[PDB]
């Protein structure tokens, strides 16, 4: 099944002729820790109801993260708007060296070993979108060997 983590709960307001009308925004990452991760958002006056909406929306945009023995195939920087996340493969002994919402995304993907630095906006939604962007652009050796028409050994 899919584990989920509540990255951020934000109380937002819209102004009306009376006072202010408040709602709650939940940003949630879902993942199975086996190479499938996804994020979603939901909004409600109640915190738990916003979480469930965010969880449901996350399941519709799961991504396939290439991995090699628990680490990424190569360095990449994921960028979304002002968010930008540098991700680098690390040795199996190393843990997830990540700061905030990056850690939630990488852990629920099943990384356990990575060197990551958030170089940009620390706004959680855009940090999360940047992280997914970088994982969306990783390429495993078997895939790039197929496009170049060589075998995996000839790549090296």
């Amino acid at each position: 099944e899919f584990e989920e983590r509540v990255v951020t709960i934000n109380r937002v307001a819209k102004v009306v002729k009376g006072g202010r009308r408040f709602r709650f925004t939940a940003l949630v990452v879902v993942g199975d820790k086996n190479g499938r991760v996804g994020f979603g958002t939901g909004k409600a006056q109640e915190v738990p109801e916003a979480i469930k909406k965010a969880v449901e929306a996350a399941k519709k945009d799961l991504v396939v993260v290439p991995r090699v023995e628990g680490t990424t195939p190569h360095t990449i920087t994921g960028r979304y708007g002002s968010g930008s996340v540098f991700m680098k493969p690390a040795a199996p002994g190393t843990g997830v060296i990540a700061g905030g919402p990056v850690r939630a995304v990488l852990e629920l993907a099943g990384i356990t070993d990575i060197l990551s630095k958030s170089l940009g906006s620390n706004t959680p939604i855009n940090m999360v979108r940047a992280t997914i962007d970088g994982l969306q652009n990783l390429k495993n050796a078997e895939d790039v060997a197929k496009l170049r028409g060589k075998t995996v050994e000839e790549l090296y």
């Binding site: 195939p73 190569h74 360095t75 493969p89 390429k139 050796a141 790039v144 790549l155 090296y156």
Partner: peptide, 11 residues
């Protein structure tokens, strides 16, 4: 030769 860069971890 001893500091030749690898591109995309060899990919």
């Amino acid at each position: 030769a001893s500091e030749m860069p690898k591109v995309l971890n060899g990919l």
